[PDB]
Amino acid sequence: VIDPNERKARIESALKALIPMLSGYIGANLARSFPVFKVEELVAIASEGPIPALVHGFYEDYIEANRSIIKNARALGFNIEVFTYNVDLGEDIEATKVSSVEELVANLVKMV
RNA sequence: AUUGAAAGUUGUAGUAUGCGGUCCUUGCGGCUGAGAGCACUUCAGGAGUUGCCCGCGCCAGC
Numbered sequence: 108v109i110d111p112n113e114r115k116a117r118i119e120s121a122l123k124a125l126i127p128m129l130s131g132y133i134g135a136n137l138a139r140s141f142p143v144f145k146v147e148e149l150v151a152i153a154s155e156g157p158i159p160a161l162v163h164g165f166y167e168d169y170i171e172a173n174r175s176i177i178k179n180a181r182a183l184g185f186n187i188e189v190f191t192y193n194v195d196l197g198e199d200i201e202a203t204k205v206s207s208v209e210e211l212v213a214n215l216v217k218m219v
Numbered sequence: 220a221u222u223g224a225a226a227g228u229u230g231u232a233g234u235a236u237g238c239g240g241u242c243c244u245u246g247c248g249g250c251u252g253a254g255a256g257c258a259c260u261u262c263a264g265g266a267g268u269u270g271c272c273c274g275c276g277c278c279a280g281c
Contacts, residue, residue, distance in 0.1 A: 135275060 119216050129208045146208060148193035152177065153215055158185060170194055177202075190214055 109117075131144030150173050152158060159180060162172045174197050181187055181200075189202040190211055196202050205211045 135277065138278090139280090 115219060118219060122212050122215050125212060126209055146192065149211075150192070150194050150196065151190045151211060151215075153188040153190070153218060155186060158187060170196065174200065188218065 129144070129146050129149075131142055134140075134142070150161070150170075152161060159176060162169045162176065166172070173194075177187065177189055177196070178200060189196070189200060190205045191202045192205045192207075192211065203214060205214060
């Protein structure tokens with residue numbers, strides 16, 4: 108319904124909304140607490156159509172589950188683009204080794 | 220009003236006194252309203268249905 112440029116700008120705004128997410132701007136009591144934040148590791152998949160939800164990082168062996176859910180999804184015929192930070196994720200998987208959070212957002216907005 | 224004139228055929232009298240139509244007598248004895256009989260046989264309370272969607276326990280706290 109809206110102009111295509113409006114849709115695009117909304118897309119990059121939503122993607123860049125993650126910049127004040129992994130920097131320590133979550134939760135409440137920011138004035139006094141402002142928690143000591145660091146991103147230990149992360150894995151992201153972009154794709155274009157419907158893809159299965161990634162496994163939560165709560166579990167201890169979620170890296171193996173992520174590898175198994177990525178390789179087989181790509182084998183099934185999904186054009187999934189994978190970005191990894193501080194996660195090996197094997198060697199046979201074409202995954203972009205990102206270095207931070209904002210450049211991950213740059214990679215996401217590259218494919219708009 | 221004369222073959223006429225006056226002239227009770229009358230008085231008293233229980234056809235009565237007593238006397239069980241009576242005595243004895245099972246309408247009685249024996250007798251299955253009885254024997255055989257599925258109110259049975261076949262039946263989905265069934266198909267479809269998000270208890271959904273939005274939500275800072277929040278901001279000032281030597």
